[PDB]
Amino acid sequence: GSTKNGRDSNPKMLGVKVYGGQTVTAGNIIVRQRGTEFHAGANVGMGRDHTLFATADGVVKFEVKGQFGRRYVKVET
Amino acid sequence: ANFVLNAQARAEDKQGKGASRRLRRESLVPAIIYGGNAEPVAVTLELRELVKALESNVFFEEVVEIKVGDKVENVKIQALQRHPAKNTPMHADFKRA
Amino acid sequence: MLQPKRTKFRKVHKGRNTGLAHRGSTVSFGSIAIKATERGRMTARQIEAARRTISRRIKRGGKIFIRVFPDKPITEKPLEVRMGNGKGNVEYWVCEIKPGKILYEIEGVNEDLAREAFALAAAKLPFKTTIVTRTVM
Amino acid sequence: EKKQSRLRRAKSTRLHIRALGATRLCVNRTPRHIYAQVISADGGKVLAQASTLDASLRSGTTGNIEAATKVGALIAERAKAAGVTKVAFDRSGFKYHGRIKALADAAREGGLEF
Amino acid sequence: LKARYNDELKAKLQEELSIKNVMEIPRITKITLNMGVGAAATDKKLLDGAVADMQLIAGQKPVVTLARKSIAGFKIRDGWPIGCKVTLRGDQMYEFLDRLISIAIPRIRDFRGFSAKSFDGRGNYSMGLKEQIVFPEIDFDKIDRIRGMDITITTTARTDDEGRALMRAFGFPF
RNA sequence: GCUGGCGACCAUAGCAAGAGUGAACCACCUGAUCCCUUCCCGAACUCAGAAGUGAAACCUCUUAGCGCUGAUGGUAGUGUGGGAUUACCCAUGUGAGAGUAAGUCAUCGCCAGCU
RNA sequence: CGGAGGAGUACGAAGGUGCGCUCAGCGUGGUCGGAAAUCACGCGUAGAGUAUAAAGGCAAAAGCGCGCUUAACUGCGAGAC
Q: What PANTHER family does the record point to (chain E)?
């Protein structure tokens, strides 16, 4: 006989690009995510595909905040 | 009075996985004593004496005296870890009475 | 032969059997029990045969508690077949056994008769075993 | 519950104002009194306050469009001294109409830009 | 009711129930009328007849109620409406309990149809009224086949004894 | 001392039970004249005033009843080197989860009002 | 030539904006309507939904409704994957 499986999609290369304590310039992408695993904070923008990017020069920082416990990523100038 | 278990001080250098395995090879069982008004105390007891105490049923519902040096600690048995296969004792907790 | 009524997946990976059975090593449904001391696999037919042997000698005078269930499917290739062309077909179910795992408990029977029944049952199993009794701690 | 509904309605506007980082002109309506506040972007410092409970307007009805207009004039007067020019209005979950509308119009007449 | 209620029945309800605070007196909050035309999609006109009759009986425009979810057993699904209802408060509800207790009760074929029991347990009382005849309205001629009615009374009563006391003060038969 | 509004945290902060407040504030409460509203309803939204109330709700204080936080010791796992090959042992570094003792009825900012 | 499923589309609203609203499930009463139709109150709680397979997500809801509309524009584009 023959198997009816044997298919998979191409890789997408999702994940974090800039970690905490790193210096970034305006426009740098910080996180690539299929959903909102991380939420934008101060000086961080959100794209149509949920990508997070920097809107100002500074240093990246990660935190946990809010009632829901949402993880946030921000940039400190 | 019935149950008087001898013990020795177990310092920091005698704590951890390697030291515990060495003690069990030397036929000693580590144990901990905790309770109100005093900090936890780590001791080492003898396997034969602990087993003989274990055979007795009243040992679980009566008070027992652990002696290390001149110090005496009056406690009750709270927990007992056993090897899942051989069933030999491996560790003990004692609540100050 | 005991078998799951339903499952999410028909076929599962082989895996590896390591470690000890910290859970399920205590007597909780009876006074006397049989406990494994070396790791292995135990099949549904072996479970049934051991249960039958124990029940016959105890003369159905007490309760037998079975704490092993064959939940893991195992496949086999047809025969006279070359390598390749997909995974084989499910053929029987097993239960992984780690040292210290309890297999059968007996309640409401004399200790000597229960020990004799366990001795009869042990001759059917593929691993070493011992007998344990309930303890306070 | 009415207050919970009002807060849930006002939360979106408050969050957007915080994201925009603009000075906030907050208001509160009550059957008896109306209050107004002007808060900085950080949200921890109240730049300029006003209310109908002040001595000048206490003797009045304090619960109508005239009181709202007086409060708006007073808050605009205080804001001009404070030195804030550009502000963002915040209805705080109250429909922009009637007393709120009159208060906002009075502030605009006073000079606050929004 | 109306002024007579507010003037006299509040006072005797306070006296009868022996409640310290005046606000604790039970108050009628609303009455809801509900009627459903099952399988309306089949003929597509019983619904129009029903809304016309409801508008005639009550001085309020009824709202057509859509179905939620789809049920295979019946022909209904979320698409088309299946029933209508109205909610009455204020002077409207007052004149409503009024003319009901006035004209409808002497004419009911079987008196005491309303029962002391059947209360929901929270102080609210539900009644079912058979046929859309049995009110002051147009006669059998010039109207569509007969239809049922459901009325529900919600008050401020905190329990069944308070509710029954309120209905007895109003004049409910049972 | 006490009320309202705007803030930093998000259960050691929450849920449940009990007690109290209206002098000022909050809420309920009155009506459909003017503004506004209901896929029908002054139920919501909006307006004009205040006859009474703390009933409901809000706020404050207490209970650990729940919920939640949580040691120590031990165990599992694991990087490097060595010995074995049912997956373990020794040297060294590292070290959970669960469970136990114990703990928890939060806390800190800005503005306005009253006795 | 390992295990298990989808795709070769749909939508001038199923897009934009302003405003507004929360699901599903159970417990009590009522017409020919009862396991299961519509309606009133109460209990715990996202298990509802998101045009479509699954994953990651969704309270300022990304879920649901109404009014007005065409940014489903033109010329670009610091800086990043």
A: 60S RIBOSOMAL PROTEIN L11-RELATED
Contacts of D79 (CB under 8 A, 6+ apart): D38, D47, D48, D87, D107, D110, D111, D112
Taking the CA atoms of residue E96, residue E100, residue E101 and residue E105 in that order, the dihedral angle to the nearest 10 degrees is -170
Q: Answer whether C12's CB lies under 8 Å from C99's CB.
A: no
**CA–C1' nearest nucleotide, residue E67:** G38
State the Cα–Cα distance between residues A39 and A73, nearest whole angstrom.
6
CB of D86 within 8 A of CB of D21? no
Experimental method: cryo-EM
Tell me how long chain B is. 97
Q: Do residue B77 and residue C21 have CB atoms under 8 angstroms apart?
A: no
- The rounded distance, in Å, linking the Cα atoms of E174 and E163 is 12
The C-alpha atoms of residue B46 and residue B54 are separated, in whole angstroms, by 12
Number of H-type helices and E-type strands within chain B = 2, 6
In contact, D25 and D103? CB cutoff 8 Å: no
Alpha-carbon gap, residue C94 to C42, rounded angstroms: 6
Number of domains in chain D: 1
How far is Cα D11 from Cα C9, in angstroms, rounded to an integer?
Answer: 46
CB contact at 8 A, E96 and E7: no
Residue linked to tokens 């200790």: C111
What is the crossing angle of helices D65-82 and D98-110, to 10°? 30
Closest nucleotide C1' to the C-alpha of B40:
F72
Report the gap between the CA of C96 and the closest CA in chain B (Å). Answer: 16
Alpha carbon distance E118, E39 (integer Å): 28
Contacts for C63 with CB less than 8 Å, ≥ 6 apart = C29, C30, C106, C107, C108
| Residue D43 domain boundaries | 1-114
- C105 φ, ψ (degrees, to nearest 5): -110, 150
Q: Determine the 3-state secondary structure of A60 from DSSP.
A: strand
For the CA atoms of B52, B57, B62, B68, what is the dihedral angle to 10 degrees?
Answer: 10
How far does A9 lie from chain C, in Å, by closest CA? 20
Buried b or exposed e, range E86-125, using 16+ CB within 10 angstroms: bebeeeebbebbeeeeeeeeeeeeeeeebeeeebeeebbb
Q: What SS3 state is found at D47? A: strand
CA closest to F77 C1', residue: C19
The token pair at B42 is 């780590």
Give the CA-to-C1' distance from C34 to F20 in angstroms. 65
User: What does the alpha-carbon distance between residue C107 and residue C124 come to, in Å, rounded to a whole number?
Assistant: 21
Beta bridge pairs of residue E126? E152
Chain F nucleotides close to protein (CB under 7 A) are: 4-10, 25-29, 32, 35-36, 39-50, 52-57, 71-78, 86-95, 97, 99-102, 109-113
Rounded Cα distance, C41 and C71, in Å: 11
CA distance A24 to A30: 9
Phi and psi at residue D67, in whole multiples of 5°?
Answer: -65, -40
Instruction: Please report residues of B whose CB lies closer than 8 A to that of C22.
Output: 84
- Amino acid at site B69: G
